């Protein structure tokens, strides 16, 4: 019995969209608490029978890359922090410390001798050192895909379970730039009971503090019942540093950061230094500190107070451990002995804080409010909204999504078999998982690291892509070769991957041409993989050395194909134009591949001396004044030329698209009879302020609304084919392409911002749709949340992450834009959508990076554009905070994020080749995905185990029957099943032993994990 995620509006105490509509967002000087007020407390609130219990929680924020690389920080800082934590905690049994980033901890632990490993395990087992979250990193929450948030969580927690025998149930996220409800969603399904966040808008902190709503049960926006709820603590102040964690007055709190007295090269900007605690000052010092604590305690509902004690890369030097510990010990001894304070203070861990809060709750001392919504877009002060990092370093944002899919496909393809250790499958997959996991860091995918650190992340991800390719192609060879013939060399390349959209045409010449010829090689096998659990057809393309190529399946059935030229665009420094050149040596062949659920399909490409019966050739039309010829080698159809003009295209029975004379979409007509709906693409530019605060990697501070890019008279190329047509235009900084294959168009932008300093390029869609001030954007590729433009906030506050899509709608019409990469975007006026393409910024934005963004490189952004009639759809009510995709939009998103994978057989002949794998796999209902398939055991395990993460989205009911699908039971995908268990999403805890060894399908918007055990 599934909860209805559409028709029941949850009743919550705080709903963030509603809160935003009501709040004034005034930025007034609140006094010492600059963004709050002067807190008052009744000194008689605490007495002998009701004391304030204070947990001082030492911590050290360690960025896995930011200003230095991961390895540089490890050598210079983190290895010392961890080595000294081990010594100091061992020697001081009441001292405590929390640790978040398992990438660093694993890097350290594996370099320890056994003696030290044992000492480390002992300070963990006794609770002095406590892991918080236990992910590989502390991830970004804006740009990250939920699948990769889960991947990195699993990587860190699997390491902790194996080596430390612990699994954290409290999360610590002090640093991501705004916070997403995807986090409690994943954490609550991974055994967590509590979480902590910090970087929320200063106005939200003030509002919630006033109502004592900084601790709340955070549920998903659609969750009527509350089963997704996770207890959440929001910190109240401007920073997680010591000046902003003891209480509301940083001039006072800074005096209790004992690293700031001078010899460490640190000081207090409020001009009052810390003083060493002595018997002659401890009473006065304690009075000041307890004062701060009791003020902070006024903001919360229990008598249990959390005081973080730390900052970036703290607790390095032995002298620093001593100075913080000894001074706090003197304070605690005094405070705890002086009845008049009515305080019991101690070093603690995060879990100890939460346990004590919940003890107070059970004692009936507090009830907590319920909350739904998100915490974007963050501003830390004034109008400094952190919407710039939704776009910064977009090449690597796109690379994240490519590697996301590669990791899934490599793990899935190799899961079907057990592999010998010599095959190095587990080794390559662990490397790939860890490099993608590292990049989820809040200075990785966010694009907020120094140039050489971005380079490090890129090199790591490139190695991870090669690892995935190796595992994938070994797996394909095994799955599709007759078993008695299969003779693997585990170092050999049986196949190479062919990827048409990464790095992309015009980004890198990386694609191999299939070289055929009468005097060399008549034919070539290619294989497609489909990681999705339903049959899929999709056009696929390969480069070939002749236009006279035909396609067959492995039963030798002809397959209809289309050949087109290979076009590349060149900024001609002679003529000062951007125009295409066609290859005279290679050609593109395109055909529909039909591939089983989670399966493989083989095809053959064969050369002939002349036009094959089942291959057609696209026409090509170059629109420009003053054309010159465009020879195409053997290509059988001459290029046509014309002056710029409006054009219309229709592929199959799909929509008819009309384009301006500048090659940009102007309208879509869904069906023969239907209207030509205005849908206009436009490119614009934002600039930077010449006075006041400057945009940088983090902040978007535009100097007003965007101005149209001056287009001149651009060259437009039209390719018209039976299977695929396109319009491409060379605009300043963007080669913009609209591709039609018979359904929703695909948009590709090759974006090269070149040397345009202090410029952000935006792609806008203008329509008639009466959306008003409402639009929808996704959170981590998991859910769509309703946004409301607010004219009381500046432009940059109305920008939100677009990690996978966005839409606007009215009563009748919806326009959805799906993305293959996370970027920033908004709807700044009724009927508009816009999404930032790249940004190049000369200035630092005072958040610690110490550089602008001047390392741009060409990137190929990909999208799908879905215009739909929605008046017949069953949509949520006007008060519901969520929205949901249609079937077509969801499929278009899957097309972008998890396309078919293409393999080209490397050798001349593939002996023992088979035509298909997975023809007997169940074809599951369209809303269900097998997000993860991963074998969990190495070959020496008697009982093999395979883990599956199943996710069911929720698609709108719009009157399409779309029926008959097969039940997917992941537990019977592999033979000889002996047991099936439901587990946490990390696979680390068994939750239910399943009857009949059958894994049930999940409810809409739910994600479940299962592990099947096999005795073979
Ligand atoms: C201006 O911020 C600098 O000082 C504060 C202390 O109040 C530090 O928190 C940060 S470093 C911190 O935040 C940046 C974004 O500002 C992030 O990129 C890093 O990962 C860190 O988490 C600054 O040094
Ligand atoms: C892992 O933790 C639990 C703690 O109760 C314990 O039963 C188990 O023995 C531990 N495993 C060890 C210490 O190897
Ligand atoms: Zn950080």
- Neighbouring C-alpha atoms within 13 Å toward the C-beta of 44: 0
Query: What CA–CA distance (Å, rounded) separates 250 from 238?
Result: 10
DSSP string, 78-91: IHHHHHHHHHHHHH
Query: What CA–CA distance (Å, rounded) separates 628 from 620?
Result: 14
CA-based torsion, 792, 793, 795, 797: positive or negative? negative
Six-digit token string for 139 = 């991830």
63 lines ligand 1 (CB under 6 A): yes
User: In angstroms, what is the span from residue 124 Cα to ligand 2's centroid?
Assistant: 12
Q: What is the DSSP letter of 392?
A: S
380 lines ligand 1 (CB under 6 A): no
Query: What CA–CA distance (Å, rounded) separates 885 from 864?
Result: 13
Bridge partners of residue 88, in order along the sequence: none
The answer to whether the beta carbons of residues 991 and 957 sit under 8 Å apart is: no
The answer to whether the beta carbons of residues 178 and 375 sit under 8 Å apart is: yes
Phi-psi region of 37 (alpha: psi -120 to 50; beta: other; left: phi over 0): beta
Listing from the earlier edge strand, what are the strands of the sheet with 52-61? 304-312, 52-61, 343-347
Nearest ligand 1 atom to the CA of 449 is 18
Query: What CA–CA distance (Å, rounded) separates 403 from 899?
Result: 12
Q: Tally the residues of the chain.
A: 1016
DSSP string, 616-683: EE-EEEEE-SS------TT-SSPPEEE----EEEE-TTS-EEEE-TTS-EEEEE-SSSS--EEEEEEE
SS3 content of the chain, % helix, strand, coil (to 5): 25, 30, 45
CA-based max dimension of the chain: 100
Query: What CA–CA distance (Å, rounded) separates 332 from 343?
Result: 9
User: In angstroms, what is the span from residue 868 Cα to ligand 1's centroid?
Assistant: 44
Residue 19, φ and ψ in degrees, nearest 5: -60, -45
847 lines ligand 1 (CB under 6 A): yes
Residue 635, φ and ψ in degrees, nearest 5: -55, 125
CA distances from 831 to 344, 768, 777, 785 (A): 58, 5, 15, 18
443 lines ligand 1 (CB under 6 A): yes
According to DSSP H, which parts of 137-244 are helical? Answer: 146-164, 182-188, 202-210
Choice from 848, 849, 851, 853 to test ligand 1 binding pocket (greatest atom count within 8 A of CB): 848
Query: What CA–CA distance (Å, rounded) separates 486 from 469?
Result: 19
Query: What CA–CA distance (Å, rounded) separates 486 from 473?
Result: 14
Q: Which residue has the tokens 């991870």?
A: 464
Q: What is the DSSP letter of 481?
A: B
Nearest ligand 1 atom to the CA of 243 is 7
- Neighbouring C-alpha atoms within 13 Å toward the C-beta of 719: 24
- Neighbouring C-alpha atoms within 13 Å toward the C-beta of 619: 6
Query: What CA–CA distance (Å, rounded) separates 828 from 813?
Result: 18
Six-digit token string for 729 = 């235009």
User: In angstroms, what is the span from residue 135 Cα to ligand 3's centroid?
Assistant: 14
Give the CA dihedral 991, 433, 402, 424, nearest 10 degrees. Answer: -120
Query: What CA–CA distance (Å, rounded) separates 905 from 909?
Result: 8
* Number of Cβ atoms within 10 Å of the Cβ of 491: 10
Instruction: Give the closest residue to 252 by CA, choosing from 294, 278, 285.
Output: 285
Nearest ligand 1 atom to the CA of 177 is 15
User: In angstroms, what is the span from residue 606 Cα to ligand 3's centroid?
Assistant: 54
User: In angstroms, what is the span from residue 121 Cα to ligand 2's centroid?
Assistant: 11
* Number of Cβ atoms within 10 Å of the Cβ of 674: 12
Query: What CA–CA distance (Å, rounded) separates 656 from 725?
Result: 11
Residue 66, φ and ψ in degrees, nearest 5: -170, -85
167 lines ligand 1 (CB under 6 A): no
How do beta strands 1007-1014 and 944-952 pair?
A: antiparallel
User: In angstroms, what is the span from residue 203 Cα to ligand 3's centroid?
Assistant: 22
The answer to whether the beta carbons of residues 881 and 372 sit under 8 Å apart is: yes
User: In angstroms, what is the span from residue 118 Cα to ligand 2's centroid?
Assistant: 14
User: In angstroms, what is the span from residue 806 Cα to ligand 1's centroid?
Assistant: 30
The answer to whether the beta carbons of residues 620 and 717 sit under 8 Å apart is: yes
DSSP string, 239-304: -SSGGGTSSS-HHHHGGG-TT-SSTTS---TTS-------TTTHHHHHHHHHHHHHHHHTTSSSSE
Residues 6+ apart with CB under 8 A from 572: 578, 579
CA distances from 635 to 45, 611, 613, 616 (A): 87, 10, 16, 11
266 lines ligand 1 (CB under 6 A): no
Instruction: Give the closest residue to 526 by CA, choosing from 562, 554, 555, 488.
Output: 554
Looking at all shown ligands, the one closest to residue 166's CA atom is: 2
Residue 911: burial class (beta carbons within 10 Å; 0-12, 13-18, 19+) = exposed
Query: What CA–CA distance (Å, rounded) separates 1 from 260?
Result: 58
Bridge partners of residue 977, in order along the sequence: 1014
Q: What is the DSSP letter of 75?
A: I
CA distances from 615 to 501, 591, 618 (A): 23, 9, 10
DSSP string, 527-584: EEEE-SSS-EEEEEEEEES-S-EEEEETT--EE-EEEEEEEEEEEETTTTEEEEEEEE
Bridge partners of residue 888, in order along the sequence: none
Query: What CA–CA distance (Å, rounded) separates 524 from 903?
Result: 11
Q: After which residues is the chain broken (C to N over 2.5 A)?
A: none
Data resolution in angstroms: 1.3
175 lines ligand 1 (CB under 6 A): yes
Nearest CA to ligand 1 atom 23: 848
According to DSSP H, which parts of 23-145 are helical? Answer: 70-73, 79-91, 102-109, 114-125
Nearest CA to ligand 1 atom 24: 848
Taken in order of first residue, the domains within the chain and their CATH numbers are 1-382 (3.20.110.10), 383-493 (1.20.1270.50), 494-618+899-920 (2.60.40.1180), 619-898 (2.70.98.30), 921-1016 (2.60.40.1360)
293 lines ligand 1 (CB under 6 A): no
Instruction: Give the closest residue to 891 by CA, choosing from 535, 399, 601.
Output: 535
Q: Which residue has the tokens 């966040």?
A: 197
**What kind and span of H or E run contains 231?**
strand 230-234
844 lines ligand 1 (CB under 6 A): no
How do beta strands 52-61 and 343-347 pair?
A: parallel
Write down the number of H helices and E strands in the chain: 16, 49
According to DSSP H, which parts of 843-988 are helical? Answer: 887-897
Nearest CA to ligand 1 atom 12: 175
Vertex 468, ends 462 and 472: CA angle to 5°? 150
The answer to whether the beta carbons of residues 778 and 802 sit under 8 Å apart is: yes
Report the structure determination method.
Answer: X-ray
Query: What CA–CA distance (Å, rounded) separates 578 from 728?
Result: 11
448 lines ligand 1 (CB under 6 A): yes
Query: What CA–CA distance (Å, rounded) separates 945 from 979?
Result: 9
Residue 399, φ and ψ in degrees, nearest 5: -55, -35
424 lines ligand 1 (CB under 6 A): no
The answer to whether the beta carbons of residues 155 and 135 sit under 8 Å apart is: yes
The 10 Å CB-count burial string (b at 16+, else e) for 567-577 is: bebeeeeeeeb
Query: What CA–CA distance (Å, rounded) separates 726 from 860?
Result: 16
User: In angstroms, what is the span from residue 125 Cα to ligand 2's centroid?
Assistant: 9
User: In angstroms, what is the span from residue 847 Cα to ligand 1's centroid?
Assistant: 6
927 lines ligand 1 (CB under 6 A): no
DSSP string, 958-999: -S------PPP-GGGSSSSEEEEEEE-TTS-SEEEEPGGG--
Choice from 847, 850, 851, 853 to test ligand 1 binding pocket (greatest atom count within 8 A of CB): 847
Query: What CA–CA distance (Å, rounded) separates 339 from 726?
Result: 79
Cis peptide upstream of residue 503 (ω within 30 degrees of 0): yes
Cis peptide upstream of residue 377 (ω within 30 degrees of 0): yes
66 lines ligand 1 (CB under 6 A): yes
How do beta strands 513-514 and 536-544 pair?
A: parallel
């Amino acid at each position: 019995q599934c909860q209805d995620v559409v028709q029941d509006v949850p009743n919550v105490d705080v709903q963030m969209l509603e809160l935003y509509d009501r709040m004034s967002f005034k930025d007034i000087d609140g006094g010492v608490w600059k963004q709050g007020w002067n807190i008052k407390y009744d000194p008689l609130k605490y007495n002998a029978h009701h004391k304030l219990k204070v947990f001082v929680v030492p911590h050290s924020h360690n960025d896995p890359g930011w200003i230095q690389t991961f390895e540089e920080y490890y050598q210079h800082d983190t290895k010392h922090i961890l080595s000294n934590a081990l010594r100091h905690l061992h020697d001081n049994p009441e001292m405590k410390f929390i640790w978040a980033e398992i990438s660093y901890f694993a890097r350290f632990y594996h370099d320890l001798g056994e003696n030290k490993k044992l000492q480390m395990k002992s300070i963990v087992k006794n609770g002095q050192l406590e892991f918080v979250t236990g992910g590989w990193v502390m991830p970004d929450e804006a740009n990250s895909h939920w699948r990769n948030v889960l991947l990195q969580l699993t990587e860190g927690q699997t390491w902790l379970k194996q080596f430390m025998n612990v699994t954290p149930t409290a999360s610590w996220a002090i640093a991501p730039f705004g916070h997403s409800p995807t986090m409690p969603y994943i954490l609550q399904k991974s055994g967590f009971k509590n979480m902590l966040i910090q970087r929320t808008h200063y106005s939200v902190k003030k509002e919630l503090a006033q109502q004592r709503q900084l601790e709340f049960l955070w549920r998903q926006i659609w969750d009527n019942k509350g089963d997704t709820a996770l207890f959440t603590h929001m910190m109240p102040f401007y920073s997680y540093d010591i000046p902003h964690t003891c209480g509301p007055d940083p001039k006072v709190c800074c005096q209790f950061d004992f690293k700031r007295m001078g010899s460490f090269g640190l000081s207090c900007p409020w001009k009052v230094p810390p003083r060493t605690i002595s018997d002659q000052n401890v009473a006065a010092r304690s009075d000041l500190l307890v004062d701060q604590w009791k003020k902070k305690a006024e903001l919360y509902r229990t008598n249990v107070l959390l005081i973080p004690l730390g900052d970036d890369f703290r607790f390095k030097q032995n002298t620093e451990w001593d100075v913080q510990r000894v001074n706090y010990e003197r304070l605690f001894e005094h405070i705890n002995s002086q009845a008049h304070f009515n305080v019991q203070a101690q070093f603690g861990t995060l879990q100890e804080y939460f346990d004590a809060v919940h003890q107070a709750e059970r004692a009936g001392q507090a009830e907590f409010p319920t909350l739904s919504g998100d915490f974007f877009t963050y501003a830390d002060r004034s109008d400094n909204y952190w919407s710039g990092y939704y776009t910064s370093r977009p090449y690597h944002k796109r690379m994240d999504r490519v590697l996301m899919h590669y990791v899934r496909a490599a793990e899935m393809l190799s899961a079907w078999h057990s592999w010998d250790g010599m095959a190095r499958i587990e080794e390559r997959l662990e490397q790939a998982r860890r490099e993608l996991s590292l990049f989820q860091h809040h200075d990785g995918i966010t694009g907020t690291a120094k140039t050489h650190v971005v380079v490090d992340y890129e090199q790591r991800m490139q190695e991870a892509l090669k690892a995935c390719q190796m595992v994938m192609q070994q797996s394909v060879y095994r799955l599709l070769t007759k078993p008695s013939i299969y003779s693997p060399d585990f170092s050999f390349s049986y196949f190479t991957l062919d990827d048409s959209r990464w790095p992309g045409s015009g980004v890198e010449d990386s694609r191999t041409t299939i070289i055929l010829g009468e005097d060399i090689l008549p034919s070539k096998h290619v294989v497609m993989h489909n990681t999705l659990p339903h049959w899929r057809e999709q056009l696929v393309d390969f480069y070939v050395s002749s236009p006279f190529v035909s396609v067959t399946d492995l039963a030798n059935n002809p397959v209809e194909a289309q050949v087109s030229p290979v076009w590349s665009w060149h900024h001609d420094t002679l003529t000062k134009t951007i125009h295409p050149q066609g290859s005279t040596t290679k050609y593109r062949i395109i055909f529909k591949a039909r591939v089983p659920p989670m399966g493989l399909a083989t095809y053959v490409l064969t050369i002939s001396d002349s036009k094959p019966e089942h291959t057609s050739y696209a026409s090509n039309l170059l629109l420009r004044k003053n054309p010159t010829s465009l020879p195409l080698g053997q290509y059988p159809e001459d290029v046509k030329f014309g002056d710029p003009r409006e054009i219309s295209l229709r592929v199959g029975n799909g929509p008819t698209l009309a384009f301006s004379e500048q090659g940009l979409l102007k309208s879509i007509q869904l069906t023969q009879d239907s209207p030509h709906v205005p849908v206009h693409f436009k490119f614009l530019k934002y600039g930077v302020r010449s006075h006041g605060d400057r945009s940088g990697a983090y902040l978007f501070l535009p100097n007003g609304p965007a101005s149209p890019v001056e287009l001149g008279q651009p060259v437009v190329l039209v390719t018209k084919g039976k299977l695929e047509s396109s319009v491409s235009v060379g605009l300043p900084s963007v080669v913009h392409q609209t591709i039609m294959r018979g359904g929703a168009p695909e948009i590709r932008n090759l974006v090269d911002i070149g040397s345009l300093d202090n410029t952000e390029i935006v792609m806008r869609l203008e329509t008639h749709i009466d959306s008003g001030d409402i639009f929808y954007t996704d959170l981590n590729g998991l859910q769509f949340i309703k946004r409301r433009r607010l004219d009381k906030l500046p432009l940059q506050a109305n920008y939100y992450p677009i990690p996978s899509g966005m839409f606007i709608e009215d009563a009748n019409t919806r326009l959805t834009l799906l993305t293959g990469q996370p970027l920033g975007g908004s709807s700044l006026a009724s009927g508009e959508l816009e999404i930032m393409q790249d940004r190049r910024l000369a200035s630092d934005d005072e958040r610690g990076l110490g550089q602008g963004v001047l390392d741009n490189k060409p990137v190929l952004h990909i999208y799908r554009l879905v215009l739909e009639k929605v008046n017949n759809c069953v949509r949520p009510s006007k008060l519901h905070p969520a929205g949901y995709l249609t079937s077509a939009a969801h499929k278009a998103s899957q097309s972008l994020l998890d396309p078919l994978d293409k393999f080209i057989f490397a050798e001349n002949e593939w002996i023992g080749a088979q035509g298909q794998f997975g023809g007997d796999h169940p074809s599951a209902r369209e809303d269900l995905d097998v997000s993860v398939m991963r074998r969990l055991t190495k070959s020496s395990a008697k009982t093999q185990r395979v883990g599956y993460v199943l996710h069911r989205t929720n698609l709108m009911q719009c009157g399409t029957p779309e029926e008959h699908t097969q039940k997917l039971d992941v537990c019977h995908l592999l033979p000889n099943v002996a047991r099936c268990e439901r587990t946490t999403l990390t696979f680390l805890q068994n939750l239910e032993h399943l009857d009949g060894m059958v894994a049930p399908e999940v409810c809409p918007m739910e994600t479940a994990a299962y592990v099947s055990s096999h005795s073979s």
